[PDB]
Write a protein that binds this ligand. Structure first.
Ligand SMILES: [Zn+2]
Length: 366
């Protein structure tokens, strides 16, 4: 069982666990209660195991898309923020931590894809997808290319597919309708066709993955890529003069990336639920608490309005949140997994020519 009278917190080592431990110190220095921050390997797989026997940490930090499965198993306590605290965070971030109508975690950080561009090769990046073919022809006359990004994973291609009407599961009145999938409607077909035409006209290559795209942009071979906040650390080393901006529009509508929310959940077996609430609301989710974690390792964009307004002085972070609000929350329901594999195969088959766009998307509907 979980020990009463202390807080044990699990958070991945790629986040500011040392900064989180300093927040624990301010807590441990005006409450008396000790906070121990641990970063065990594969914590997202260990947590459901230990929490099923009534053990594990008091608080777990992870991407919200895994918290739906935790909540399905009753591993997470229903949190009780009052309306005043809820208004301190962006409303769409609360959508990411709701399961079966219950809030089951506190939103912390916000992740979304943006357009990354080389200011030297391209000082004013394009605003729409439609102008990218001609811009590629201009750059190819100089021996550069316009755009390279990961075509193997649908996380990277979905923003264009979703723009004109494609969607995963219909989201209304706070619930996903698993009987309503929108991968082969007219809008999804239109965006995927534009993608395939880019490959047929040799503006992109179907075999490009994460590594080929990153290496090409970091060496100045291509003018743009598409990636998230975790990729910036590599571009900084390349000394490529780069910027981050809003994704291009398609048919006048914004590209719609899926939004990931780093969230903090309270173990349902914890005897320290009131201590955890005090720590998360009044120490971590403050300007001073988020600053302590951010100075350790950058969080990207954040769900707390007051601190996001300061972080957005960085145009890369402002662009991240702008794309996040133009996108959609990643569904946390279990059917989401069958969606991703289906769309992954459809995009791969349409890009290579194994299937037409219509046939690939139809097979993805079922
Ligand atoms: Zn992150």
């Amino acid at each position: 069982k979980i020990e009463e009278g202390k807080l044990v917190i699990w958070i991945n080592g790629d986040h500011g666990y040392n900064g989180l431990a300093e927040v624990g110190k301010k807590f441990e220095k005006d409450t008396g209660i000790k906070v121990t921050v641990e970063h065990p390997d594969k914590l997202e797989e260990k947590f459901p195991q230990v929490a099923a026997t009534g053990d594990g940490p008091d608080i777990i930090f992870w991407a919200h898309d895994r918290f739906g499965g935790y909540a399905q198993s009753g591993l997470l306590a229903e949190i009780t923020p009052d309306k005043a605290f809820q208004d301190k965070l962006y409303p769409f971030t609360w959508d990411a931590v709701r399961y079966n109508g219950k809030l089951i975690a506190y939103p912390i950080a916000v992740h979304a894809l943006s357009l990354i561009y080389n200011k030297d090769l391209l000082p004013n990046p394009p605003k729409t997808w439609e102008e990218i073919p001609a811009l590629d022809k201009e750059l190819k006359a100089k021996g550069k290319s316009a755009l390279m990004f990961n075509l193997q994973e649908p996380y990277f291609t979905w923003p264009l597919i979703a723009a004109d009407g494609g969607y995963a599961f219909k989201y209304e009145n706070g619930k996903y309708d698993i009987k309503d999938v929108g991968v082969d409607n007219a809008g999804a077909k239109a965006g995927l066709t534009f993608l395939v035409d880019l490959i047929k006209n040799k503006h992109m290559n179907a075999d490009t993955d994460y590594s080929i795209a990153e290496a090409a942009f970091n060496k100045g071979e291509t003018a743009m890529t598409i990636n998230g906040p975790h990729a910036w650390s590599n571009i900084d080393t390349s000394k490529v003069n780069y910027g981050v901006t809003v994704l291009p529009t398609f048919k006048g509508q914004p590209s719609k990336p899926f939004v990931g929310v780093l969230s903090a959940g309270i173990n349902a077996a914890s005897p320290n639920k009131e201590l955890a609430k005090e720590f998360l609301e009044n120490y971590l989710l403050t300007d001073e608490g988020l600053e302590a974690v951010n100075k350790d390792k950058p969080l990207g964009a954040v769900a707390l309005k007051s601190y996001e307004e300061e972080l957005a002085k960085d145009p890369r972070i402002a662009a991240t949140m702008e794309n996040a609000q133009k996108g959609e929350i990643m569904p946390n329901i279990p059917q989401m997994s069958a969606f991703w594999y289906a769309v992954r195969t459809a995009v791969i088959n349409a890009a290579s020519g194994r299937q037409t766009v219509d046939e690939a998307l139809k097979d993805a509907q079922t």
